[PDB]
Design a protein around this ligand. Structure first.
Ligand SMILES: CCCCCCCCCC[N+](C)(C)[O-]
Ligand SMILES: CCCCCCCCCC[N+](C)(C)[O-]
Ligand SMILES: CCCCCCCCCC[N+](C)(C)[O-]
Ligand SMILES: CCCCCCCCCC[N+](C)(C)[O-]
Ligand SMILES: CCCCCCCCCC[N+](C)(C)[O-]
Ligand SMILES: [Mg+2]
Lengths: 65, 107
């Protein structure tokens, strides 16, 4: 694929991995497997990265998808 | 045009002409978002009685205070500029945080 299509695919893959990881931590939190302080610290960092990944996806796909 | 032409070259995260202030605004939004998402999971976990009542109150208090600090910056007008476009993306892809939004409304 082109550099552009490679880039977009990687960002989507990264978005899904970030969601997978936030959900994994969320399941641990609800279960009591990790403390609240740990979820907040790690959860916030991943969500921060996810915003920017999604911002990036939007910037690429803004030509009417 | 085919996709190969439409998505030929890599696109940078921010436009190469983004001002220092504009970039700062977006970075502040990323922090606001992380609080919204994180809080939404905390609210939901509290509903399942999996979080200690004291730890929950302290954690949510801290998140609420932090949210206020971020919001009360970046000219204050420039953050609302993006809020609508964030809602349009979120509605398109069904990205929700309704428990967080409800809590942030009150506190
Ligand atoms: C949606 C199916 C498309 C899968 C495309 C996989 C991309 C392979 C990229 C290979 N490479 C090692 C050069 O990054
Ligand atoms: C712009 C760089 C974004 C890379 C995101 C990669 C997602 C994997 C996150 C892995 N981990 C759960 C350990 O933080
Ligand atoms: C999905 C990644 C697994 C997360 C497991 C959490 C381990 C955190 C250890 C750090 N801590 C200081 C709390 O011991
Ligand atoms: C999960 C929330 C992510 C929303 C991202 C919104 C992207 C707005 C980008 C605006 N812009 C004109 C630069 O394309
Ligand atoms: C072009 C792909 C856009 C990536 C963002 C998509 C958000 C996925 C929403 C997942 N969810 C299950 C909560 O609806
Ligand atoms: Mg798994």
């Amino acid at each position: 694929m082109t550099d552009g299509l490679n880039q977009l695919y990687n960002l989507v893959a990264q978005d899904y991995a970030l969601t997978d990881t936030i959900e994994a931590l969320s399941r641990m939190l609800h279960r009591g497997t990790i403390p609240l302080d740990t979820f907040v610290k790690q959860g916030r960092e991943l969500a921060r990265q996810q915003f920017l990944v999604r911002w990036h996806i939007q910037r690429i796909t803004s030509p009417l998808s | 045009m085919d996709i190969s032409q439409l998505f030929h070259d890599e696109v940078p995260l921010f436009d190469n002409s983004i001002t220092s202030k504009d970039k700062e605004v977006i970075e502040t939004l990323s922090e606001i978002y992380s609080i919204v998402i994180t809080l939404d999971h905390v609210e939901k976990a509290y509903l399942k009685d999996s979080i200690d009542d004291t730890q929950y109150t302290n954690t949510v208090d801290k998140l609420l205070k932090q949210f206020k600090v971020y919001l009360n910056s970046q000219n204050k007008e420039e953050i609302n500029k993006h809020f609508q476009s964030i809602e349009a993306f979120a509605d398109t892809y069904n990205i929700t945080a309704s428990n967080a939004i409800t809590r942030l409304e009150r506190g």
